[PDB]
């Protein structure tokens, strides 16, 4: 009825005409864009991150786009535009490889955690013979949406979805849930989940999170310290995420002078410990950041930063602004069986 209210549409994907005709047809594996690929994206995200992401509204034939351009909308507001080179597919291959078979490469780094190497799409069987995986431009859209939903956790974890997952949990763990909701109010619990998924910490393993809450919230009602204790009880997931299956984890470290000047950050005069810190140092550390970083390749994940226990979150809150692709952890969030390889000396 045109005389009611309407609910805000979360995520809209506009296409120009050529992509809208391209999503008509089946792929090599015969799959539909709308009926197979998007749901499989959602399920894979749910296995990766503990988040139920909403379904996607795709509108064809945008007035505002060329035919090989696409746009993504947050809450009926466009968020970022994209382009696709015509008749090219995106696979991350080293410049060495891009010239070791004599194929074209077009450098176009479309978003930040995505490959930057476009090769003419007639070369597909060549890349299959060379055992190089390539992505359909539709699969490129899928990858860019996935990067969105990783980077845009914050806007989709509000209180009603937290309630929905807690009420799913009640079916199995009702007295645990009742203890948790005696200890933690629902808004503050949602805040804890948000501050977890800030650093790409999955909350798929709800059981361990709830157990750690029911331990630690016996005493402490600050949301952020409880988030820290949840991290320090997710040692196993953090170690598997960042040490990538090895005997060892290869991280960066701080300088202890930096650690002992981030004891400067204390703000006991205010309720929260907001940042009381020499303004120049936001360059002064950060220069030594920029000359230290290894550029990870685009399909993997960045090098890790290992900090002292109490200053992990302040480091992450500082360095997300330019480098959202840093995971900050501290000593308590890894297994004390792992050997840590000291290979940054950042002063």
């Amino acid at each position: 009825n045109p005389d009611d209210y309407s609910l805000t549409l979360p995520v809209i994907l506009e296409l120009g005409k050529d992509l809208s005709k391209l999503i008509q047809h089946k792929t090599k594996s015969g799959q539909s864009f709308v009926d197979d690929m998007i749901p499989k994206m959602r399920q894979a995200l749910y296995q990766d991150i503990g988040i139920r992401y909403p379904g996607i509204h795709v509108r064809t034939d945008s007035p505002s786009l060329e035919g090989y351009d696409y746009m993504i909308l947050l809450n009926e507001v466009p968020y970022v535009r994209g382009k696709i080179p015509p008749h090219h597919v995106l696979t991350n291959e080293v410049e060495d490889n891009l010239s070791r078979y004599n194929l074209p490469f077009i450098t176009y780094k479309n978003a930040a955690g995505l490959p930057s190497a476009w090769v003419s799409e007639d070369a597909k069987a060549i890349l299959e013979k060379a055992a190089i995986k390539y992505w359909t431009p539709l699969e490129v859209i899928i990858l860019h949406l996935s990067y969105f939903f990783h980077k845009s956790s914050q806007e989709f974890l509000g209180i009603q979805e937290v309630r929905s997952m807690i009420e799913f949990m009640e079916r199995s763990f009702p007295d645990l849930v009742k203890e948790v909701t005696r200890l933690i109010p629902l808004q503050k619990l949602t805040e804890i989940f948000k501050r977890l998924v800030q650093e790409q910490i999955s909350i798929k393993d709800l059981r361990t999170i709830l157990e750690s809450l029911s331990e630690w919230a016996q005493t402490e009602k600050d949301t952020v310290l409880l988030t820290e204790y949840v991290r320090s009880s997710l040692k196993l997931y953090i170690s598997f995420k960042f040490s990538q299956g090895q005997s060892a984890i290869s991280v960066y470290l701080l300088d202890p002078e930096i650690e002992e000047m981030i004891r400067g950050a204390i703000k006991q005069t205010s309720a929260g410990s907001y940042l009381a810190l020499d303004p120049d140092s936001v360059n002064l550390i950060l220069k030594s950041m920029r000359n230290t970083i290894t550029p990870t390749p685009a399909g993997g994940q960045p090098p890790v930063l290992l900090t002292a226990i109490d200053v992990r979150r302040y480091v992450r809150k500082l360095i997300e602004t330019e480098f959202p692709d840093i995971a900050v952890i501290s000593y308590q969030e890894i297994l004390p069986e792992i050997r840590i390889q000291p290979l940054g000396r950042i002063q």
Partner: protein, 74 residues
């Protein structure tokens, strides 16, 4: 007699100071070695322990400096 007390208390503080800097250096050199997380957690806990002993020695030194200054103002 209060200068001798001051020497006593400053020696008793300086032994703790030397131990605390030894613990800091051992922290730093086991960071440089590539030890495990067990080692660093345990040494940080023991540093948090010996911080209180260092602070008690500092407070005793401050009390003894009070008394020596009072005896000088005699």
């Amino acid at each position: 007699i209060e200068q001798e007390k001051l020497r006593e208390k400053e020696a008793e503080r300086d032994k703790v100071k030397n131990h605390y800097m030894q613990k800091i250096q051992q922290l730093r050199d086991l960071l440089d070695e590539g030890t495990t997380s067990d080692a660093v957690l345990q040494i940080k806990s023991y540093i948090k322990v010996v911080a209180v002993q260092l602070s008690e020695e500092e407070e005793k030194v401050n009390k003894q400096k009070e008394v020596v200054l009072a005896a000088s103002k005699e």
